[PDB]
Write a protein that binds this ligand. Structure first.
Ligand code: HEM
Length: 291
């Protein structure tokens, strides 16, 4: 099935910058969430999980249809906690009821990355809501207890190569694992609501110990109070991934540029953009607007 991008009727860049801005202003205001981490990280994860159900083989799942709004997908165990990002976006959607669900979930992720001082992420509109029966089944999002071979094979289904996977994993600088949500506990670093290449630096430079958490799952822990999932740690066990981790640990601009591309791609899998669709938008941050 082909999903053709269809611009919300009569809308243009300024309309979407207003939605961006409303998201960004609420991100600034609602700062208490998650022990003052704020909503940035969970909004990035929401964009990823709403996109990461995609299957390149048959074009099922993906960001286009905004299917997270249906109970099968919002109750996926893999999505535990993302309801906080959805609830954040509710008043945004009420103010701007013309935006599609897929466009709002993906735009929330773009807005969060940029407001957290991350790279610019070009973003295209035109996702169209699809019906409840187009919601993908549970089980398309990845397990965390696995090795590098798992990670590599997993991401082939999303048409991501080694560089794209290692870049995308850099988003694990953000936020934290929560025991009751995933069976893992702890942040990956100190700067967890500012977008940096810290994930790579910590992988290479902390002294990691393989421990069991209070849910009886293994994770890697450091004396600084940081953690890595087994799938994170797999990026330094596999020699191909390791080379790329070192590259991003040593070049912040390269990480930014490669993350931006990979994240846009993730958010756009499955969508056909007509030849005469608008160019991708690059939104100004609040800071750049003086707001
Ligand atoms: C092998 C792939 C991946 C696995 C197994 C994985 C697993 C996890 C797990 C278990 C959590 C903790 C959830 C919780 O307890 O709250 C988490 C959090 C998070 N992940 Fe992933 N992840 C992967 C890839 C990605 C990608 C590709 C991105 C986005 C580009 C991403 C962004 C995030 C963010 C931002 C958080 C923090 C959420 C928060 O603080 O609420 N992850 N991930």
């Amino acid at each position: 099935l082909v999903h053709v991008a269809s611009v919300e009727k009569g809308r243009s860049y300024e309309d979407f910058q207003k939605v961006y801005n409303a998201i960004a202003l609420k991100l600034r205001e609602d700062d208490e969430y998650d022990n003052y981490i704020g909503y940035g990280p969970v909004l990035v994860r929401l964009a990823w999980h709403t996109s990461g159900t995609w299957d390149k083989h048959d074009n099922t799942g993906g960001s286009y249809g905004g299917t997270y709004r249906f109970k099968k997908e919002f109750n996926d165990p893999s999505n535990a906690g993302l309801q906080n990002g959805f609830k954040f976006l509710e008043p945004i959607h009420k103010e701007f009821p013309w935006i599609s669900s897929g466009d709002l979930f993906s735009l929330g992720g773009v807005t969060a990355v940029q407001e957290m001082q991350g790279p610019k992420i070009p973003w295209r509109c035109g996702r169209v809501d699809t019906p409840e029966d187009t919601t993908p089944d549970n089980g398309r999002l990845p397990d965390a207890d696995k090795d590098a071979d798992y990670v590599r094979t997993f991401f082939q289904r999303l048409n991501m190569n080694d560089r794209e996977v290692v870049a995308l994993m850099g988003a694990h600088a953000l936020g934290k694992t929560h025991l009751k949500r995933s069976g893992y506990e702890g942040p990956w670093g100190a700067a967890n609501n500012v977008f940096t290449n810290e994930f790579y630096l910590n992988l290479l430079n902390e002294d990691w110990k393989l421990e069991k958490n209070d849910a009886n799952n293994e994770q890697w822990d450091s004396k600084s109070g940081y953690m890595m999932l087994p799938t994170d740690y797999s990026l330094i066990q596999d020699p191909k991934y390791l080379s790329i981790v070192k590259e991003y640990a040593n070049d912040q601009d390269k990480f930014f540029k490669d993350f931006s591309k990979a994240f846009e791609k993730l958010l756009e899998n499955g969508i056909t953009f007509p030849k005469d669709a608008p160019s991708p938008f690059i939104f100004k941050t609040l800071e750049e607007q003086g707001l």
